[PDB]
């Protein structure tokens with residue numbers, strides 16, 4: 001039961017750890033540019049690192065949501081592998097963005113490709129669990145009993 | 150097992166897709182107002198669209214959390230319908246806010262009403278799974294065995 | 299089945315309610331300092347309360363992710379208790395930060411300690427569900443069948 005989802009839980013935990021890493025980098029920039037809470041503005045370099053962390057934070061719940069839907073309704077290994085590709089592409093996005101706004105783009109598109117792939121696996125998984133049942137009911141003349149609307 | 154939660158997974162996926170839509174709108178405003186990363190400040194219109202996306206992002210994990218608690222402990226269909234009302238009210242909030250800060254308010258209250266309804270269904274669901282067991286133990290003089298505290 | 303995770307669902311719901319409380323406090327500061335949407339800048343006090351809510355929002359999905367992994371793979375009661383310690387430390391962080399940036403630090407470290415503890419329980423739980431199986435396969439000379447890589 002539990003170990004049917006243990007790989008998804010492991011990829012989730014690795015994402016939490018990546019977020020802690022991004023957070024550690026912003027704490028470091030905060031010393032390196034004397035940025036003092038409660039402020040988020042500062043030199044362009046600090047501003048880039050800080051924006052990279054905010055962006056990764058916005059998308060972290062989206063990644064988790066699709067990872068779990070894809071892993072449960074499609075295939076656990078397929079979703080987990082795709083989750084790892086997304087996480088590694090985000091690490092590179094962060095490191096890229098810290099150096100320059102242009103250098104963030106190649107790993108940003110790689111991560112966008114990986115997240116859309118997870119959205120596609122989630123959609124396919126959901127369709128695989130609804131379309132066959134609807135097909136069976138339609139062929140048996142029992143569709144109204146499955147969905148009156 | 151899986152299809153006991155397939156409607157919640159479908160509503161979750163639709164919310165991820167709505168977030169991608171909001172993100173596409175901010176990318177468009179970014180060209181229309183020459184706002185260049187790493188900046189989030191700009192004309193009041195861009196500022197409104199950008200704030201709308203930030204707000205929807207803050208609340209997206211809250212919506213997911215209550216949707217899943219309500220859908221598992223209350224009733225799956227009730228929670229899923231309520232999730233759809235929330236998602237559609239957020240689309241209208243976004244479109245409203247893009248035009249004016251006042252025009253965002255009616256769909257914002259509609260979405261606040263829909264999210265509180267999901268919080269209420271989650272609370273009711275949780276109570277339905279704890280209060281009867283506690284009542285049974287109290288009536289049987291076995292409460293200490295269920296909860297010593 | 300459901301009540302195997304009902305305590306985790308209850309702690310989740312309490313976190314959603316805490317977030318609604320933080321949100322109510324920022325709405326109040328917004329009147330008290332005439333900050334008008336779409337703006338997030340203002341007096342240092344408003345700026346502190348607003349930053350406190352943003353920080354709690356960034357970490358809310360991280361807390362949920364680890365609470366569920368720890369509660370499912372480690373022990374439900376252990377994770378749920380730890381989740382409560384984290385939530386209460388965040389309330390104090392918020393109240394502290396509202397008064398001063400220095401006063402936020404003691405409950406911030408308390409919440410950081412509580413979240414790392416949840417990360418540790420999640421990691422331990424995941425290891426408890428993989429390392430014994432790998433040990434059994436290695437001892438039986440059946441490791442390649444469990445993991446070819």
Ligand SMILES: CCCCCCCCCCCCO[C@@H]1O[C@H](CO)[C@@H](O[C@H]2O[C@H](CO)[C@@H](O)[C@H](O)[C@H]2O)[C@H](O)[C@H]1O
Pocket residue numbers: 075077078079117124127
């Ligand atoms: C209302 C909607 C109407 C229904 C429309 C249906 C959409 C049709 C889209 C194509 C159908 C799915 O096509 C299928 O895709 C997946 C993933 O790309 C492939 O799947 C394979 O590669 C993926 C890579 O991500 C692996 O994770 C997976 O384990 C493996 O089986 C299949 O080899 C292919 O056959």
Ligand SMILES: CCCCCCCCCCCCO[C@@H]1O[C@H](CO)[C@@H](O[C@H]2O[C@H](CO)[C@@H](O)[C@H](O)[C@H]2O)[C@H](O)[C@H]1O
Pocket residue numbers: 224226227228266273276
């Ligand atoms: C420590 C706490 C002490 C216990 C206090 C208990 C609180 C009492 C509150 C009212 C009890 C629940 O009351 C119940 O609400 C739900 C939802 O509104 C209604 O439920 C109905 O409408 C909702 C609409 O959201 C549908 O999704 C649901 O499928 C349907 O059954 C019931 O018809 C009503 O009987």
Ligand SMILES: CCCCCCCCCCCCO[C@@H]1O[C@H](CO)[C@@H](O[C@H]2O[C@H](CO)[C@@H](O)[C@H](O)[C@H]2O)[C@H](O)[C@H]1O
Pocket residue numbers: 373375376377415422425
């Ligand atoms: C590739 C990795 C290699 C494997 C390395 C393994 C790491 C070893 C770390 C120590 C092993 C776990 O050690 C174990 O920790 C937990 C939590 O702190 C304790 O657990 C106890 O306290 C915790 C407090 O959080 C309670 O929630 C829990 O219900 C209770 O049983 C155990 O009494 C201790 O024996």
Ligand SMILES: COc1nc(N(CC(C)(C)F)c2cc(Cl)c(F)cc2F)cnc1C(=O)[C@H]1C[C@@H]1C(=O)O
Pocket residue numbers: 055056059062104108111112113115116117119165166168169170172173186
């Ligand atoms: C994966 O990250 C991102 N995805 C985005 N989209 C939205 C669009 C409309 C492009 F599709 C998107 C959404 C979903 Cl659901 C998905 F499955 C895949 C995606 F690509 C958009 N922006 C980012 C960023 O992080 C940029 C803010 C960072 C920067 O510009 O530096």
Ligand SMILES: COc1nc(N(CC(C)(C)F)c2cc(Cl)c(F)cc2F)cnc1C(=O)[C@H]1C[C@@H]1C(=O)O
Pocket residue numbers: 204205208211253257260261262264265266268314315317318319321322335
């Ligand atoms: C649903 O969205 C929102 N909900 C809010 N609350 C918090 C309060 C104290 C009002 F209850 C709230 C919280 C929970 Cl848990 C809920 F179940 C229902 C809710 F209404 C508050 N603000 C928004 C916004 O999006 C505003 C930032 C956007 C803007 O002002 O434009």
Ligand SMILES: COc1nc(N(CC(C)(C)F)c2cc(Cl)c(F)cc2F)cnc1C(=O)[C@H]1C[C@@H]1C(=O)O
Pocket residue numbers: 016017019020021023024037353354357360402406409410411413414415417
């Ligand atoms: C629990 O909150 C926080 N945790 C942080 N880290 C990241 C570091 C590198 C410190 F470990 C962290 C990450 C994980 Cl995964 C965890 F398990 C425990 C943690 F401590 C960091 N910052 C906060 C804040 O809220 C600060 C922004 C608020 C402020 O500075 O006021």
Ligand SMILES: CCCCCC/C=C\CCCCCCCC(=O)O
Pocket residue numbers: 027035036037406407410411
């Ligand atoms: C492992 C526990 C770590 C807890 C997270 C630490 C977070 C933030 C510390 C920011 C310190 C305040 C910055 C200095 C500003 C000033 O002194 O003027």
Ligand SMILES: CCCCCC/C=C\CCCCCCCC(=O)O
Pocket residue numbers: 137138139140141142143144145
């Ligand atoms: C491979 C595609 C074949 C699809 C078959 C669909 C067949 C018939 C559609 C008519 C349904 C209307 C009859 C109502 C009776 C009922 O289903 O309860």
Ligand SMILES: CCCCCC/C=C\CCCCCCCC(=O)O
Pocket residue numbers: 108109112113176184185186
């Ligand atoms: C489907 C893949 C889409 C990936 C998401 C694209 C995101 C961001 C692109 C922002 C471009 C940089 C803005 C221009 C600023 C300047 O040139 O001065």
Ligand SMILES: CCCCCC/C=C\CCCCCCCC(=O)O
Pocket residue numbers: 286287288289290291292293294
């Ligand atoms: C419909 C409301 C009826 C509630 C009934 C509650 C009854 C008695 C409360 C006394 C409990 C203290 C006895 C301790 C013994 C034990 O439960 O283990």
Ligand SMILES: CCCCCC/C=C\CCCCCCCC(=O)O
Pocket residue numbers: 257258261262325333334335
């Ligand atoms: C229970 C429903 C509550 C819904 C959440 C309310 C949220 C925001 C209201 C902000 C009001 C606009 C501020 C005044 C600015 C101005 O008039 O110039």
Ligand SMILES: CCCCCC/C=C\CCCCCCCC(=O)O
Pocket residue numbers: 435436437438439440441442443
């Ligand atoms: C308590 C620690 C004991 C660890 C025991 C590990 C033993 C042997 C490692 C050799 C594995 C290589 C053999 C390949 C055959 C197979 O497992 O399929």
